[PDB]
Amino acid sequence: DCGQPRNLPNGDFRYTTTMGVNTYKARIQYYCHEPYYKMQTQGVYTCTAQGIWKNEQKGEKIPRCLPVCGKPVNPVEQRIIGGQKAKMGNFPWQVFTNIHGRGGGALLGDRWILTAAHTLYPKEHASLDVFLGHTNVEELMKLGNHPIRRVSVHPDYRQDESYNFEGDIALLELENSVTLGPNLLPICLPDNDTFYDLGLMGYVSGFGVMEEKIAHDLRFVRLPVANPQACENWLRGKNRMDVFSQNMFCAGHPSLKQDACQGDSGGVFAVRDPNTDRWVATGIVSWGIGCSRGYGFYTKVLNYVDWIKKEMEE
């Protein structure tokens, strides 16, 4: 008979033959919930005369539906202090954080939230509150928080040193993975050093603290990767002795009026890789000085990519 087909997590199967009938010559075609998930690599299985559900090439083994990163359904339009409110589906990876205070993160894979270490262990200092899958703050609250099982702060980060954000970056493993959708999708990780070329325009979305009021909805701003040197000057120019390592990078400009502010840290600096039309998280909103001013600092994710993979590789 073959019995009922195994259920394909994050995917489903359809009968090409008479529905519900699981006997010889029975034919079902498995499929993954695309574009949120993609089938690892043709989904066609039949009830073999051996009374087993088998695919021409494999058989005994059903497909695997893996999560798809950085390929949002409703991309941002080309034409946080600095304005503009994000639309549903623009940043399916944005996460809302409320540990010590409002913060942000980015969904990685299907059960990991990437964010800023300082977001967990602040300078001069709780319930790990995390929400995802929505633009409006009330809604994320109603949707409920997503319990956290593991917390993985990078080794280099140090909390006692209030002016050293080196290694600022952490990982949050959700207790239970989520179900991707047009409004909840992971972002990809960088892999080429070019994701830091000067003048490169990346995005920073968050529920920070805009100009004069609190933000009830996710907002975003586009910023260009700035020249380190210039930032390095500007920084010492104001006599700041803050750390600015190769493991960081700066963006924005002192003359820009758009910028991430109080509450956007932990959020991510997103770049739509033109080469693949997929969005990668090149940086983590780490620190700066004031807001509307200029030159913000972000953790160079590209340098922790391996560290991240290991932590979530389990």
Short mmCIF file of C-alpha atoms in Angstrom, two decimals:
data_model
loop_
_atom_site.label_atom_id
_atom_site.label_comp_id
_atom_site.label_asym_id
_atom_site.label_seq_id
_atom_site.Cartn_x
_atom_site.Cartn_y
_atom_site.Cartn_z
CA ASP A 1 0.00 0.00 0.00
CA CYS A 2 2.79 2.45 1.02
CA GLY A 3 0.54 4.23 3.47
CA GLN A 4 0.31 8.00 3.82
CA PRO A 5 3.38 9.97 2.65
CA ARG A 6 5.78 11.47 5.22
CA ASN A 7 5.02 15.13 5.86
CA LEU A 8 7.58 17.48 4.31
CA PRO A 9 8.47 20.20 6.84
CA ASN A 10 8.10 23.66 5.28
CA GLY A 11 6.70 22.08 2.18
CA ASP A 12 3.81 19.96 1.06
CA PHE A 13 2.98 17.25 -1.43
CA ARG A 14 0.24 16.91 -4.01
CA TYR A 15 -1.20 13.81 -5.65
CA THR A 16 -0.77 13.67 -9.44
CA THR A 17 -2.83 10.50 -9.28
CA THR A 18 -6.16 10.07 -7.48
CA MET A 19 -5.92 12.00 -4.22
CA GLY A 20 -5.58 10.16 -0.93
CA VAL A 21 -5.03 6.88 -2.73
CA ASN A 22 -1.68 5.49 -1.59
CA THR A 23 -1.27 2.26 -3.54
CA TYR A 24 0.77 0.98 -6.49
CA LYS A 25 1.52 3.50 -9.27
CA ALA A 26 0.45 6.24 -6.87
CA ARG A 27 2.19 9.50 -7.67
CA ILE A 28 2.68 12.57 -5.46
CA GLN A 29 4.87 15.55 -6.20
CA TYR A 30 6.52 17.19 -3.24
CA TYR A 31 7.10 20.93 -3.19
CA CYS A 32 8.65 23.51 -0.88
CA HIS A 33 6.98 26.70 0.32
CA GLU A 34 8.82 28.84 -2.20
CA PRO A 35 10.18 31.55 -2.22
CA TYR A 36 10.54 31.41 1.55
CA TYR A 37 12.06 27.96 1.30
CA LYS A 38 13.90 26.21 -1.51
CA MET A 39 14.28 22.49 -2.13
CA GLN A 40 17.80 21.26 -1.44
CA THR A 41 19.59 19.80 -4.48
CA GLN A 42 12.74 16.27 -8.33
CA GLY A 43 10.10 15.93 -5.66
CA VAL A 44 8.36 13.21 -7.62
CA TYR A 45 7.63 10.05 -5.65
CA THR A 46 5.52 7.00 -6.38
CA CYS A 47 4.22 4.02 -4.50
CA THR A 48 6.70 1.43 -5.76
CA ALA A 49 5.60 -2.19 -6.32
CA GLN A 50 7.72 -2.79 -3.22
CA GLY A 51 4.96 -0.96 -1.39
CA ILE A 52 7.29 1.99 -0.77
CA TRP A 53 7.13 5.68 -1.70
CA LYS A 54 10.09 6.22 -4.01
CA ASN A 55 11.57 8.88 -6.26
CA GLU A 56 13.32 7.75 -9.46
CA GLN A 57 16.77 8.82 -8.20
CA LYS A 58 16.50 8.33 -4.43
CA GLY A 59 13.21 6.84 -3.27
CA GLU A 60 13.28 5.99 0.45
CA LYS A 61 14.27 9.65 1.17
CA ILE A 62 12.01 12.69 0.97
CA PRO A 63 13.30 16.14 0.00
CA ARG A 64 14.52 18.86 2.36
CA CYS A 65 13.08 22.40 2.31
CA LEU A 66 15.77 24.84 3.38
CA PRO A 67 15.13 28.51 4.30
CA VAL A 68 15.97 31.13 1.68
CA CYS A 69 17.97 34.17 2.82
CA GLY A 70 18.13 37.73 1.55
CA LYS A 71 15.50 37.43 -1.16
CA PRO A 72 12.64 39.68 0.12
CA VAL A 73 9.21 39.66 -1.47
CA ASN A 74 8.55 43.40 -1.33
CA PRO A 75 11.91 45.19 -1.81
CA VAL A 76 12.45 48.77 -0.71
CA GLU A 77 11.90 51.64 -3.14
CA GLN A 78 14.98 53.52 -4.32
CA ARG A 79 13.51 57.03 -4.72
CA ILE A 80 16.35 56.28 12.95
CA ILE A 81 16.66 60.04 12.47
CA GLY A 82 16.45 60.96 8.81
CA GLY A 83 12.99 59.64 8.02
CA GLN A 84 11.04 57.18 5.87
CA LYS A 85 8.83 54.41 7.20
CA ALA A 86 9.45 50.84 6.06
CA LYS A 87 6.67 48.89 4.33
CA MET A 88 5.70 45.28 5.11
CA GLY A 89 8.07 42.88 3.41
CA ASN A 90 10.88 45.38 2.95
CA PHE A 91 12.99 43.93 5.72
CA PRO A 92 11.50 40.54 6.69
CA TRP A 93 14.62 40.01 8.76
CA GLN A 94 14.29 42.99 11.09
CA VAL A 95 13.90 41.84 14.69
CA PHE A 96 12.51 43.88 17.59
CA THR A 97 14.51 43.65 20.79
CA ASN A 98 13.65 44.78 24.31
CA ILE A 99 16.20 43.41 26.74
CA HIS A 100 17.61 46.37 28.63
CA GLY A 101 15.88 48.68 26.21
CA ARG A 102 14.56 48.89 22.68
CA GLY A 103 16.95 47.41 20.15
CA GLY A 104 17.22 45.49 16.91
CA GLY A 105 18.54 42.36 15.29
CA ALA A 106 18.34 40.31 12.10
CA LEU A 107 16.90 36.86 11.59
CA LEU A 108 19.53 34.38 10.39
CA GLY A 109 18.46 31.09 8.89
CA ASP A 110 15.23 30.00 10.54
CA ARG A 111 16.04 30.02 14.26
CA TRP A 112 18.84 32.49 14.99
CA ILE A 113 18.80 36.18 15.66
CA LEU A 114 22.03 38.08 14.98
CA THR A 115 22.61 41.26 16.98
CA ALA A 116 24.93 43.54 18.97
CA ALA A 117 26.75 42.23 22.03
CA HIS A 118 26.34 45.55 23.84
CA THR A 119 22.64 45.00 23.28
CA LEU A 120 22.88 42.16 25.79
CA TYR A 121 25.67 43.51 27.98
CA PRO A 122 25.50 47.32 27.88
CA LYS A 123 28.22 49.78 28.89
CA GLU A 124 27.84 51.09 32.44
CA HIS A 125 25.09 48.69 33.48
CA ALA A 126 17.13 41.05 32.12
CA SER A 127 14.34 39.29 30.24
CA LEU A 128 15.42 38.43 26.67
CA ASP A 129 12.41 39.85 24.83
CA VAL A 130 12.39 39.37 21.08
CA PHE A 131 9.66 39.84 18.48
CA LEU A 132 9.61 39.37 14.74
CA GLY A 133 7.48 39.30 11.66
CA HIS A 134 6.03 42.80 11.52
CA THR A 135 6.51 46.50 10.86
CA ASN A 136 4.23 47.99 13.50
CA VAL A 137 5.37 47.80 17.13
CA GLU A 138 1.96 47.06 18.66
CA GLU A 139 1.59 44.11 16.34
CA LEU A 140 4.94 42.56 17.25
CA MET A 141 3.88 42.87 20.88
CA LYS A 142 0.58 41.05 20.18
CA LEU A 143 2.38 38.47 18.07
CA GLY A 144 4.21 37.66 21.28
CA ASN A 145 7.85 37.32 22.22
CA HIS A 146 9.94 34.42 20.95
CA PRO A 147 11.64 32.54 23.82
CA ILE A 148 15.42 32.33 23.57
CA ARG A 149 17.32 29.09 24.25
CA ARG A 150 20.93 30.07 23.77
CA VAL A 151 22.85 33.33 23.85
CA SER A 152 26.22 33.53 22.15
CA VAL A 153 28.25 36.71 22.73
CA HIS A 154 31.53 36.84 20.82
CA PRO A 155 34.66 36.26 22.97
CA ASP A 156 36.48 39.50 22.10
CA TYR A 157 33.73 41.85 23.24
CA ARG A 158 34.31 43.42 26.66
CA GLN A 159 31.61 45.23 28.62
CA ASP A 160 33.73 46.97 31.28
CA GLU A 161 35.46 49.05 28.58
CA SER A 162 32.79 51.61 27.68
CA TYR A 163 34.75 52.99 24.73
CA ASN A 164 35.79 49.74 23.09
CA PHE A 165 33.14 48.13 20.93
CA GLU A 166 35.49 45.53 19.46
CA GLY A 167 33.76 42.19 18.97
CA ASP A 168 30.35 43.79 19.48
CA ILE A 169 28.12 41.04 18.11
CA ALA A 170 26.06 38.17 19.45
CA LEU A 171 23.71 35.38 18.53
CA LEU A 172 20.34 34.43 19.87
CA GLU A 173 19.03 30.93 19.23
CA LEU A 174 15.24 30.88 19.31
CA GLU A 175 13.72 28.17 21.49
CA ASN A 176 11.61 27.14 18.50
CA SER A 177 12.41 28.08 14.93
CA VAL A 178 9.87 30.22 13.09
CA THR A 179 7.92 29.94 9.88
CA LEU A 180 9.23 32.22 7.17
CA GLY A 181 6.85 34.40 5.19
CA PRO A 182 6.67 37.62 3.18
CA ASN A 183 7.08 39.35 6.52
CA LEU A 184 9.68 37.20 8.15
CA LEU A 185 12.71 36.02 6.24
CA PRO A 186 16.40 35.70 7.15
CA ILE A 187 19.14 37.82 5.65
CA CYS A 188 22.24 36.35 4.09
CA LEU A 189 25.80 36.66 5.35
CA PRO A 190 28.60 38.46 3.47
CA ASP A 191 31.42 36.45 1.88
CA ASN A 192 33.32 38.92 -0.29
CA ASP A 193 35.42 41.75 1.12
CA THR A 194 33.99 44.07 -1.55
CA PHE A 195 30.78 44.42 0.48
CA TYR A 196 32.68 47.26 2.13
CA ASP A 197 33.76 49.31 -0.88
CA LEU A 198 33.56 53.03 -0.14
CA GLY A 199 30.45 54.92 -1.14
CA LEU A 200 28.53 51.68 -1.12
CA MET A 201 24.91 52.31 -0.09
CA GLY A 202 23.53 49.97 2.52
CA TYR A 203 20.36 50.16 4.60
CA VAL A 204 19.73 50.47 8.30
CA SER A 205 16.22 49.77 9.52
CA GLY A 206 15.08 50.08 13.10
CA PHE A 207 12.61 51.32 15.67
CA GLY A 208 15.14 53.73 17.10
CA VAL A 209 14.36 57.23 18.25
CA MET A 210 13.66 59.61 15.42
CA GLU A 211 14.16 63.38 15.66
CA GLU A 212 11.50 64.49 18.16
CA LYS A 213 9.24 61.43 18.71
CA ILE A 214 9.17 57.71 19.49
CA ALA A 215 8.68 55.40 16.52
CA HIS A 216 5.54 53.22 16.52
CA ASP A 217 6.60 51.68 13.25
CA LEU A 218 9.80 50.40 11.72
CA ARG A 219 11.71 53.03 9.77
CA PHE A 220 14.78 52.95 7.57
CA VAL A 221 17.55 55.12 6.17
CA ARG A 222 20.10 54.61 3.40
CA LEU A 223 23.75 55.26 4.26
CA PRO A 224 27.04 55.10 2.33
CA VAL A 225 30.09 53.27 3.66
CA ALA A 226 32.50 56.04 4.61
CA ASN A 227 36.28 56.16 4.31
CA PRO A 228 37.86 54.76 7.50
CA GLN A 229 40.58 57.36 7.52
CA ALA A 230 38.10 60.23 7.41
CA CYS A 231 36.17 58.63 10.27
CA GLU A 232 39.46 57.98 12.07
CA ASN A 233 40.20 61.69 11.82
CA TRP A 234 36.75 63.01 12.71
CA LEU A 235 36.96 60.75 15.75
CA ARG A 236 40.34 61.94 17.03
CA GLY A 237 39.37 65.40 15.85
CA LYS A 238 36.87 65.47 18.72
CA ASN A 239 39.55 63.95 20.96
CA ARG A 240 37.66 60.65 21.19
CA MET A 241 39.86 57.71 22.09
CA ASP A 242 37.30 55.06 21.13
CA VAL A 243 38.42 51.80 19.50
CA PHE A 244 38.04 51.61 15.71
CA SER A 245 39.43 48.27 14.56
CA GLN A 246 39.72 46.43 11.28
CA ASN A 247 36.77 44.48 12.66
CA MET A 248 34.57 47.53 12.32
CA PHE A 249 33.75 50.02 9.59
CA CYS A 250 32.07 53.38 9.40
CA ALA A 251 29.21 54.79 7.40
CA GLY A 252 27.25 57.96 6.88
CA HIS A 253 28.75 61.41 6.80
CA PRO A 254 28.89 64.30 9.25
CA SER A 255 26.90 66.36 6.73
CA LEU A 256 24.19 63.68 6.30
CA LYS A 257 20.90 64.22 8.07
CA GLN A 258 19.84 60.58 7.97
CA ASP A 259 21.18 58.18 10.59
CA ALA A 260 20.56 55.37 13.06
CA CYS A 261 19.95 56.54 16.59
CA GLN A 262 18.92 55.48 20.08
CA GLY A 263 17.23 52.12 19.71
CA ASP A 264 18.53 50.95 16.34
CA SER A 265 21.71 49.31 17.61
CA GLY A 266 21.72 45.55 17.17
CA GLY A 267 19.91 46.27 13.94
CA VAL A 268 21.78 45.42 10.77
CA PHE A 269 23.45 47.33 7.92
CA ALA A 270 21.94 45.69 4.84
CA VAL A 271 23.43 45.65 1.36
CA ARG A 272 21.54 44.30 -1.65
CA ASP A 273 24.30 42.34 -3.38
CA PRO A 274 23.79 43.42 -7.00
CA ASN A 275 25.69 40.34 -8.19
CA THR A 276 22.94 38.00 -6.89
CA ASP A 277 20.07 40.34 -6.11
CA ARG A 278 20.19 39.07 -2.54
CA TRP A 279 20.54 41.15 0.62
CA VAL A 280 23.45 40.56 2.94
CA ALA A 281 24.10 41.85 6.43
CA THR A 282 27.47 43.54 6.06
CA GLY A 283 27.39 45.20 9.48
CA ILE A 284 25.86 45.52 12.95
CA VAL A 285 24.79 48.93 14.25
CA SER A 286 27.33 49.17 17.09
CA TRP A 287 28.04 52.74 18.20
CA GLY A 288 28.53 56.38 17.38
CA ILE A 289 28.29 59.86 18.89
CA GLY A 290 25.00 61.68 18.87
CA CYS A 291 22.85 61.01 15.83
CA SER A 292 22.02 63.51 13.07
CA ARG A 293 25.74 64.35 13.03
CA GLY A 294 27.99 61.96 11.12
CA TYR A 295 30.05 58.79 10.91
CA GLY A 296 28.48 55.76 12.55
CA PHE A 297 30.25 52.53 13.47
CA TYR A 298 29.29 48.98 12.54
CA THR A 299 30.78 45.59 13.30
CA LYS A 300 32.35 44.14 10.17
CA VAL A 301 30.17 41.02 9.96
CA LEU A 302 32.33 39.64 7.18
CA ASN A 303 34.98 39.04 9.84
CA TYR A 304 32.69 37.00 12.10
CA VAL A 305 30.99 34.99 9.38
CA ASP A 306 32.93 31.88 10.34
CA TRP A 307 32.31 32.46 14.04
CA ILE A 308 28.59 32.84 13.34
CA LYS A 309 28.36 29.69 11.20
CA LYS A 310 30.01 27.69 13.97
CA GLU A 311 27.67 28.99 16.64
CA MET A 312 24.56 28.15 14.64
CA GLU A 313 26.11 25.11 13.00
CA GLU A 314 25.61 24.07 16.62
#
